[PDB]
Structure 1
């Protein structure tokens, strides 16, 4: 059996027909599935080893999967490589290696109802007036999915703005383009459409799709996969170039639908045969495309056959003014960061400026999975517990209460920051005094109530500790007091003294409250 995952918006029935052919020829069963959140679930089920043999997604997520060792390197021969456009192979190259088979090029277009709107607008700026005109006639101008930053980026980034800077053949993770003048202008325009009742912040994919396909709204923004359902609605639609904002073309991300092979699959050779000899042929792509259109397919023979379609021409025109999605592992963080900014800006939970400031920071912030070792933070953090570590740069925002990972010599420890540079700190029995006054420690509540002896921390003062000023209990510059929540068993600053700023490598996020 080959198990294949593909997103619910794609032609999974058509893909299944190709599966039936393969079964008929080989005796091997092919099961196509379209679970929710498959792009998040894939690494989860790979960790167990009950994942799909083949996973379809846009190329952006595959860098992250490869970096985690979840994907097999693919080994097409010259003759097969030559069948696909070289730029499609570029999209599935990660650290020198091919990690997926490219299937098709996707970009969003403006889709409009010709009976409601014979002349689609050239500019985003026209849409408010157009909506007023249509509101008078019982309709609206535009509905598209506002929940996913894929759909809102074309406007957001039209006037400037990018994910990661690409230069001299590689992405710079340190150069994020979310908090800049262009994106502020675009996101502000988007928020103002909502503010002014031209769109609704709750509008998602199914709401927008239903509304356009029942003739309630004049325009939507979607990809080629959406065309089949519009064909079935008998709406008279056109697919055209996205409007300009401030005279600048919209900047959709360009995705390449790609198929990766699970590194843990026991059917890698069969997966290769299915993709190369059954799917990526004129016959196989037609089956999927007839179910839900693929876009500009990676296979030259069949792309040439479909290129006559004005809707494909429109797709690629929008793609020419777009931004190829980066495939670096950090893209996941970028998407989540931008998703949050738009929702918060659109709901008013943040101003556009707060939204983009945070998103700029979070898109570039490196987060590393970590597993807790031992009992010294028990029960706050348990042995074996999975946490997230936000890597802190050299001399870059630590506060009391932060739980941190730090080094000394191959040694790493997890402890809580109890005092930072400048803090006066001391313990009398189990009572913590910080800058003269008592500080509560709710994270010790359990261990205080279940203590073996008289006291779990016990009396001490900063002055008496290694690396402190013997003169004062005021923590010196660039130094930190760190203690384990499991005070009865923790080897911490009470044993090895104050630690240095340069020792701290990350801040720990974990399950709490």
Structure 2
């Protein structure tokens, strides 16, 4: 393999207590003799699924729970095997955050939520609303300082305000989340994002302020407030700023609803040291001495282990985190969160800068959030419709116009290049699905380069329909839907940003109308 046997390599983000975790590994090396190396790579959430799909990466990966469900869908995680004797040591909600398809995929560590952090010496009475912030900024700017400065490069810090008046990611009726209704461009988010953009335009905040310059500004006493979670308390302690942690401001009478994260530890499915990773996580990290080693470095918040939470509950700063946690909503861990996160990440940055209006950014975020879902429905319906000859009798008329347009456009194009399609077809293996799934390699390489227009996308889907028909004739019916999956993977992973600029499939409908 590509992972060394006899040691543990752990990936944890840089804002967390990576040193405090490293001394847990020194303790792990001292009783055990096995070395434990902890690293904090940048863009960890994106680099793990890339290197783990090729069978490499760390033994243990640390991040909030929202990313693990996608990693599990991609088969990058091994099921953790804790007995109930151990499960009774952590709170049930932490276990609930690491469940996907009924199988546990990671050990929960600690519950995070954003809070308002304010300098008691620059204002001893924190404002209870967001609407009070512009006026307070004018008074302190006369004193040479600012009211609020928080990171606007990651949408995690703005979602509390966006979700205040009715914004949400994916709706949770009836048993669980539904994928079709995304709430990024509702009247609530348009109002929440507008107040932030209005704060930027009236020069009360800077649109490209990030994490480091906002933390430095607060630690120096250059701002009266900012928004971050428990991991920032450590360096505010060192700056000796008399700070407080209180509940986030309300927006339009409603509380700010922060995304609740549960940082968790998953075990790589390609790792040869899965049992030692379990022993390290069960009998060393998730113990009171082990968690205190990490919490002393950078605070975790509400620890998952019940014995250590009973000791740390008395902290007024952790109590404030639960106030914001209860008034927030838990982040889903469905595999569609990555595409949702990138959609809102671009939308906040473009609206903050003025490159897009708030309405243009949020609608494009809606297209990007449902991008993969709606694309697969149209391509899967079309390939089935060309294979059977009938029609499916299953916020849907837009797909009906796209499928009817794809019927009219795909039929003519498919018979235009019909000779070339069969010459390309003439070969064909099609022995198993692994070979049909192996068409992902060829298609992504040919499609990353070259012209991007609707004509190419139609030609891509039309040959897929051409293969689907032949799949039905060679009695390979079950291979049609996996073929559609492959086409949808290739299409969106290469042309996502183009398809968003073209109104999603609405631009496909108008292009041919």
Query: TM-score of the superposition, structure 2-length normalised?
Result: 0.76
Question: Match of 1:53?
Answer: 59
Retained in 2: the 8 A contact 1:116–1:218? yes
Which residue in the other structure is 2:391 paired with? Answer: none
User: How big is each residue's C-alpha offset from its partner over 1:172-209, in whole Å with a ceiling of 9 and x where there is no partner?
Assistant: 11121112111111001011000111101110000100
Q: CA deviation at 1:366?
A: 1.7
Superposition map of 1:416-435 within 5 A: 420=409
Counterpart of 1:119?
125
Which has a greater percent of strand?
1
Question: What is the rounded CA distance, in whole Å, between the counterparts of 2:19 and 2:81 in structure 1?
Answer: 27
SS in 2 for 1:172: coil
> How is 1:3-402 mapped onto 2 (pairs within 5 angstroms)?
3-366=9-372, 390-393=375-378
**Correspondence list, 1:494-513, <5 A:** 508-509=491-492
Where relative contact order (Cα < 8 A, 6+ residues apart) is larger, the structure is 2
List alignment gaps of at least 5 residues for structure 1.
368-388, 399-403, 410-416, 428-479
The runs of at least 4 aligned residues of structure 1 exceeding 6 Å deviation read 404-407, 421-427, 490-493, 502-505
TM-fit CA distance, 1:90: 0.3
Task: Describe the superposition over 1:322-359 as per-residue Cα deviations: whole angstroms up to 9, x where unpaired.
Answer: 01000000011110111111111111111111111111
Change (3 A) 1:238 1:38: same
Query: CA shift at 1:169, angstroms?
Result: 3.0
How far did residue 393 of structure 1 move? 3.1
Number of residues of Structure 1 aligned to a counterpart in Structure 2: 422
Deviation at 1:85, TM superposition (A): 0.3
Q: What is the rounded CA distance, in whole Å, between the counterparts of 1:36 and 1:296 in structure 2?
A: 25
Q: For 1:492 and 1:67, how far apart are their aligned partners in 2?
A: 26
Query: For the structure 1 residues 268 and 190, does the alpha-carbon distance in structure 2 shift closer, same or farther, using more than 3 Å as the test?
Result: same
Distance 1:180 1:2 in 2: 45
Aligned CA-pair RMSD: 3.3
Q: Does the 8 A contact of 1:174 with 1:364 survive in 2?
A: yes
- Output the CA distance in 2 between the equivalents of 1:484 and 1:253: 38
TM-score, length-normalised on structure 1?
0.76
Name the SS of the counterpart of 2:225 in structure 1.
Answer: strand
**In 1: Cα distance, 2:22 partner to 2:386 partner:** 52
Q: Residue by residue, what CA displacement relative to the aligned partner does 1:368-398 show, whole Å, maximum 9, x if unpaired? A: xxxxxxxxxxxxxxxxxxxxx94243799x9
Q: Residues 152 and 406 of structure 1: is their aligned pair in 2 closer, same or farther, counting only changes over 3 Å?
A: farther
Could you tell me which runs of 5 or more consecutive residues in structure 2 were left unpaired when the two chains were aligned.
1-6, 389-405, 417-455, 471-480, 499-513
Greater helix fraction, Structure 1 or Structure 2: 2
8 Å CA contact 2:149, 2:209 repeated in 1: yes
Distance 1:158 1:271, change over 3 A: same
- What is the CA distance between 1:109 and its match in structure 2? 0.3
Deviations 1:93-128 (CA, angstroms, capped at 9, x unpaired): 111111100000000000000000111100000000
Distance 1:128 1:271 in 2: 50
Report if aligned partners of 2:288, 2:307 keep a CA contact under 8 Å in 1: yes
CA displacement 1:73-107 (0-9 Å, x = unmatched) = 11111111001001110000111111100000000
In the alignment, is the contact (CA less than 8 A) between 2:414 and 2:459 conserved in 1? no
Q: Please tell me whether Structure 1 or Structure 2 has the larger radius of gyration of its CA atoms.
A: 1
